Amino acid sequence: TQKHNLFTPEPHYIPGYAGFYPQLRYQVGNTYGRTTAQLLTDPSVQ
Amino acid sequence: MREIVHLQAGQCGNQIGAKFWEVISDEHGIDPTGTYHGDSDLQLERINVYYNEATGGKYVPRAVLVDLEPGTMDSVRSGPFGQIFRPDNFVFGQSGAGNNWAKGHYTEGAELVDSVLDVVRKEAESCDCLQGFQLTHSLGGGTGSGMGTLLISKIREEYPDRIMNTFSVVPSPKVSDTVVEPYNATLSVHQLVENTDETYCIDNEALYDICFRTLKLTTPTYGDLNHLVSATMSGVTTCLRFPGQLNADLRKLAVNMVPFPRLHFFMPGFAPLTSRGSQQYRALTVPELTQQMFDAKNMMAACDPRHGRYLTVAAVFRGRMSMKEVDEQMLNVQNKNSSYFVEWIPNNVKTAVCDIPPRGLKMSATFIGNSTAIQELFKRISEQFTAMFRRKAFLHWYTGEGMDEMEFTEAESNMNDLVSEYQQYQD
Amino acid sequence: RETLEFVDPFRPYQSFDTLKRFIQYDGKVLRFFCLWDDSTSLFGDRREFV
Amino acid sequence: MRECISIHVGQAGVQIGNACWELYCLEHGIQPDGQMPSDKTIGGGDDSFNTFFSETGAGKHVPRAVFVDLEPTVVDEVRTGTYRQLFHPEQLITGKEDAANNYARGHYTIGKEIVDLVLDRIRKLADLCTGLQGFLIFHSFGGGTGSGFASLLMERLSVDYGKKSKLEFAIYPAPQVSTAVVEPYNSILTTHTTLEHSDCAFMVDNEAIYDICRRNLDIERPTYTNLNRLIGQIVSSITASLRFDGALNVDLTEFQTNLVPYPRIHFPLATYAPVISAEKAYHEQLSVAEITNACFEPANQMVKCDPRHGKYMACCMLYRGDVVPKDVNAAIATIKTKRTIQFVDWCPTGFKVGINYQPPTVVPGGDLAKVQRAVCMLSNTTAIAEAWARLDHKFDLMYAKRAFVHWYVGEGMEEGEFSEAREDLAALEKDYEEVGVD
Amino acid sequence: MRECISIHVGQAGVQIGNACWELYCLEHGIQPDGQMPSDKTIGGGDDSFNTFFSETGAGKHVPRAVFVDLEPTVVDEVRTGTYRQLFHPEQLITGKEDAANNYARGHYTIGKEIVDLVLDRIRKLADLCTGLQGFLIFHSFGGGTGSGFASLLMERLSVDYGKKSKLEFAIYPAPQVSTAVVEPYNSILTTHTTLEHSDCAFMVDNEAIYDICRRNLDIERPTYTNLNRLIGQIVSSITASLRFDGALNVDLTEFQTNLVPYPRIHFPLATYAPVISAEKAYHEQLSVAEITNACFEPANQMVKCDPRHGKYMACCMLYRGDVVPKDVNAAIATIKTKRTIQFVDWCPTGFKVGINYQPPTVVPGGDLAKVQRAVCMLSNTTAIAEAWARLDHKFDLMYAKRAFVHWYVGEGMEEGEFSEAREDLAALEKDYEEVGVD
Numbered sequence A: 001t002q003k004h005n006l007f008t009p010e011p012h013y014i015p016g017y018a019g020f021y022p023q024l025r026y027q028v029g030n031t032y033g034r035t036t037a038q039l040l041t042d043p044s045v046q
Numbered sequence B: 001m002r003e004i005v006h007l008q009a010g011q012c013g014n015q016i017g018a019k020f021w022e023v024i025s026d027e028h029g030i031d032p033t034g035t036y037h038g039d040s041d042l043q044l045e046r047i048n049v050y051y052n053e054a055t056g057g058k059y060v061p062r063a064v065l066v067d068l069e070p071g072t073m074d075s076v077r078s079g080p081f082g083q084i085f086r087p088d089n090f091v092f093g094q095s096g097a098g099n100n101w102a103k104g105h106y107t108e109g110a111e112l113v114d115s116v117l118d119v120v121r122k123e124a125e126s127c128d129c130l131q132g133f134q135l136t137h138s139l140g141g142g143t144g145s146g147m148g149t150l151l152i153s154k155i156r157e158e159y160p161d162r163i164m165n166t167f168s169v170v171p172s173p174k175v176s177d178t179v180v181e182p183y184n185a186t187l188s189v190h191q192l193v194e195n196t197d198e199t200y201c202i203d204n205e206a207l208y209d210i211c212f213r214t215l216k217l218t219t220p221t222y223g224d225l226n227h228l229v230s231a232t233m234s235g236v237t238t239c240l241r242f243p244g245q246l247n248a249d250l251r252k253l254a255v256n257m258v259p260f261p262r263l264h265f266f267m268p269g270f271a272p273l274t275s276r277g278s279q280q281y282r283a284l285t286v287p288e289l290t291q292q293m294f295d296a297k298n299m300m301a302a303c304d305p306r307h308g309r310y311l312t313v314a315a316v317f318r319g320r321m322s323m324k325e326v327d328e329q330m331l332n333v334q335n336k337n338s339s340y341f342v343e344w345i346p347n348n349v350k351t352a353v354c355d356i357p358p359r360g361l362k363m364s365a366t367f368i369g370n371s372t373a374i375q376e377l378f379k380r381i382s383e384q385f386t387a388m389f390r391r392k393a394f395l396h397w398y399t400g401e402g403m404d405e406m407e408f409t410e411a412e413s414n415m416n417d418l419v420s421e422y423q424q425y426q427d
Numbered sequence C: 001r002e003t004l005e006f007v008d009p010f011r012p013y014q015s016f017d018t019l020k021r022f023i024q025y026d027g028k029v030l031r032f033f034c035l036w037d038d039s040t041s042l043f044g045d046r047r048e049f050v
Numbered sequence D, E: 001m002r003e004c005i006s007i008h009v010g011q012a013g014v015q016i017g018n019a020c021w022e023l024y025c026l027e028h029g030i031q032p033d034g035q036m037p038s039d040k041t042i043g044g045g046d047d048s049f050n051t052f053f054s055e056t057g058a059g060k061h062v063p064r065a066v067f068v069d070l071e072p073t074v075v076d077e078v079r080t081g082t083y084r085q086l087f088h089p090e091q092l093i094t095g096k097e098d099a100a101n102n103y104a105r106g107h108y109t110i111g112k113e114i115v116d117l118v119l120d121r122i123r124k125l126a127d128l129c130t131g132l133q134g135f136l137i138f139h140s141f142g143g144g145t146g147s148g149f150a151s152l153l154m155e156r157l158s159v160d161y162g163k164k165s166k167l168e169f170a171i172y173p174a175p176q177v178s179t180a181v182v183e184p185y186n187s188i189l190t191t192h193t194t195l196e197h198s199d200c201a202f203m204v205d206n207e208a209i210y211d212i213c214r215r216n217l218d219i220e221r222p223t224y225t226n227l228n229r230l231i232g233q234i235v236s237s238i239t240a241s242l243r244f245d246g247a248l249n250v251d252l253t254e255f256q257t258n259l260v261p262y263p264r265i266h267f268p269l270a271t272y273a274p275v276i277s278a279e280k281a282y283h284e285q286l287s288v289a290e291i292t293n294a295c296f297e298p299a300n301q302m303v304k305c306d307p308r309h310g311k312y313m314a315c316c317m318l319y320r321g322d323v324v325p326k327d328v329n330a331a332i333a334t335i336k337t338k339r340t341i342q343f344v345d346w347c348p349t350g351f352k353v354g355i356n357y358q359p360p361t362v363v364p365g366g367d368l369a370k371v372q373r374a375v376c377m378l379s380n381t382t383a384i385a386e387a388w389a390r391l392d393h394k395f396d397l398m399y400a401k402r403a404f405v406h407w408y409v410g411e412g413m414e415e416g417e418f419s420e421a422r423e424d425l426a427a428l429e430k431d432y433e434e435v436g437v438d
Ligand SMILES: Nc1nc2c(ncn2[C@@H]2O[C@H](COP(=O)(O)OP(=O)(O)OP(=O)(O)O)[C@@H](O)[C@H]2O)c(=O)[nH]1
Pocket: B009, B010, B011, B012, B013, B014, B015, B016, B067, B097, B098, B099, B104, B137, B138, B140, B141, B142, B143, B144, B145, B146, B177, B178, B222, D247, D248
């Protein structure tokens, strides 16, 4: 569409959301911060 | 020796005291910091009527400041003389007032009274002998009325031998601001007339008029209003702290001034007001001081006595005069209009002459008068209260506080009694 | 009019805080060595401090 | 000290709090992170900010607000937005379903599991709060959810802490505009449950904001951004007295004690005079006379009622910025000299004045200009009776034809209370009539 | 002087022994190799690390722990861990076989040829040390092997030394999640054998640990690593008085002398208030009032017992970080005033205040935030009888159906002991009721 972006890397994702995020399926890791940090730091597809 | 303790009650009285104290201090030669500068022997001696002495020459006022809104006292402390005031006399509560007189008179004052009584009696024992107390407060402001009524009531039986000089500001006959002002004023004046002996009533409509008449700047502040009123009380207090072949004591004034127990209401008046250019366009001479003093436009407290008549008058001059000019001026006014006064009493004229002219001039004055002219004012408040009471709007708060409308009925009764006795005397 | 600009309020105040500096330099220490002379007193001579 | 607690609920009631707090950050110069410059203002949450923001040693002015919403969309959006770092994370109370515009759904099926959370949060605020003059609730009447949960929450707070005021500010139904037909029903239900617990309720309407925007601001396609900025500056004017000092100070308690004569009838109107465009404000002049004539101008009210159809019994004006008492009293005297505004016989005196020195401030990217002299007017009147007359003589047909009643009864209620509300309203109109009659 | 000995028995407690020692290396900066930074701390072992390590002339701190394990797996794993060079080889006593979850197998068949070795270790440690305040033993009630050898070793140390303290922290069985139906057997046997030898047994519930975790740490799949780290910080808090000093200091001896009202009953409970995440702590304020309120809130307890339905008698209350004792005593007085807590009449004062000005310390890669005010609460109440009621009304059924008794009689045991344990539990229950009823 003709609009903005979201999800700025690492510093991102305060606790509370409902909605999909990439590769949240391997979360043995615990703090929401590190979860989201790895989630964005792994866009490795391309 | 004889000293005075000042009461600075409610938010009005707070800024009134700010201006008043800085005026007295600036005239009397004490710096804002506290380190006096040696200029004047006589002030250096008579400073003890008001200011007590710390070490080094730094002077503590004998004043008690009270309010309920912490920000008010924050601003007062912020003014140029918070450092000349003490935290010791800073006492306050936590709850906002709403300017509800019943609130100020039965619920939170009921516990705020004790501490202020203890502190004031501390200072009263610290000193030697007072003659009384001067109170600065409001009758149209909520907290002032609600608290000061209780305070004056209790101090009356604390010490039955002292003068309750009262200084209460009066709401505008054209805009009362606080819509419950009728109720506040009536309830307050009920105990005023009982406890007080002498009272000065001040209305700011005449202040606005005089701002358009001689102040002539058209862009004024309540600070300027306080300037004028503070100067007036300065003048009434000057005689004590200064030499001269005159009598000074407030009692020497009051026992001369009032004939009957139920006569308490008083009219401040001032002396030469100087405009834009009247400085170098004026000659400060006895006839013109006399004229301006007696002038109706000059009068600024309540309203023109042109409708009514005088009962007593007193005047305090301050300058290098002689007795003959003031006596002949008194005869001149007496025989110019020997009708506007009352044939009951002769010699309705009271005089005092101090020899210590103020700072900046060479002779000055001040005028106080008791005249049958407050009839219109408390008559107005009568119609206000009745026309409200006929449908008891807003009374749910006062009933929830928990009193009866009967008490209101006795208040209006006492008010009408004052009306009736003023009428029945003058006419 | 400087008095009338003195009458122009801002409601001022000042206070203090510790946490940010505390954390910024949390868990670091400088290490330095020194010596005190003692032979002035007729019993002690030397001792070393850190 | 001088602090109050802020509350917002509903799709209706979220962007408004968003904008109001976006205004609240400016005057203290809050960097959108939440940190002051190296200059010195932080402490134990004790300075000009303390009336709104709790800045303990963290160096972050943590707001004293509570946003609650049943639907995750907009709350997640603002959590994605600018100041989510400034906002308290779990404080943002979130649900997974709606009230389906049904008051009774919002009041009996889903509210029962959220009150415990909200009570925990509010009292954990209250413990560290010291003064706590009162609350500041934001909801809606005909809202899809702001009816039922709002009513239940105000019930519980009014029955647990009954020794303090409550200020209700709400968006009144549009008189000849509708967004949902549930609005008559849920509006009257909310009103009849409230009035016996509400203290001072201020109604606003959006059609008049619309008309104003091109009446003098002259942007013909404004938005919610503009609406929210306007109501924001309204609440900023009403909180200025707490924020700073002035010639004379006024307080919410004074509002409570003065503006309302009687219980039941506690429904004032506002008006903000100098809404005007940038170049208009720049190259036009302002003073107390014209701004007061503007505040009493009969076309600028945010309720399409006519004061000269109605009457007047009590008024309160709050002036912000450079003023003097002289011209103020002169202008009010002239207004009394006028003969069109018909004050009742009841109060021959009816004007509550207030002054604050600090001028109102622009917002960056704001449709306003710099102000020097602002005046917010709060008046009580009887003309509003025509609006409730409108609402009842619309509700009559609906309750006659008993439409949509399955929607309510199947989710659990009955009709006795729906009957009862209509004579509650009729009581309101008859009260208006008798008190208005001299 | 002031130094203690640590014991960890059971592949249950191995992770937590590992974790607590990992955390203990941090605050003294003990590099994982065994040496320090370029700084000078090496000597005979009289300085801050003196209470947990004995560092000799080559500068290698010696942990004063004993890791006893029966199944080579976990001991080999930890010995392959990072701190292997730190640890001591035959302080890591390893065995081959298990107890088959059987208390009697672990109490009569295997250990009788291992207690010689473990006693030799403990005695040559005791001879070298001088302070010897006591032992800190970790085992597991829901223990396949952390139960039998635990009982045997505690019996032997009771019968060889009798003038020091014994402190034991044991993971409780879950109220409704049984990882093994051998629990009803082994738990009560261990309990009745220990009652007259154990000093002050403490316990905790891992389900409740998880509950708190996803409550305010907001983590959805936490691990054993977190479960262990938190309790490690707990024991750090309870030995801070040994570690640093403060305004006042308290010790295990005082806990022994003060936290148990009568013989037998020595089952307290624990709570740690500021278990919080990074941004929560970063921009939400902490202070004595709210932290004490949180630690007295019923849901924060790590054992499922409603405080309200039972009765409190004992409280010991230890603050770590900066705090001014004025607010401490003010807050505790306010708690006494608060109605909701229902004290018994026997001890009108029952509080044990303790202060250490040393702040708690974080762990690298950690999931705790930074704290300048924290507290551990260690209290005793009467409600705990519910758990014993639960386990006994399970065991009565399972015994009356004598399920699995073949195992235990075959490995060589009889039923008189079963009875003895049963009516010992019965006696403790009526003792609880007698002490409760005032
Ligand atoms: N000091 C001061 N007083 C003012 C000023 N303007 C008006 N006032 C009057 O002062 C009155 C009362 O002051 P207080 O003695 O403190 O009375 P109160 O019980 O606090 O009641 P209110 O102030 O009226 O709410 C107010 O009612 C005003 O009418 C002003 O500029 N300065």
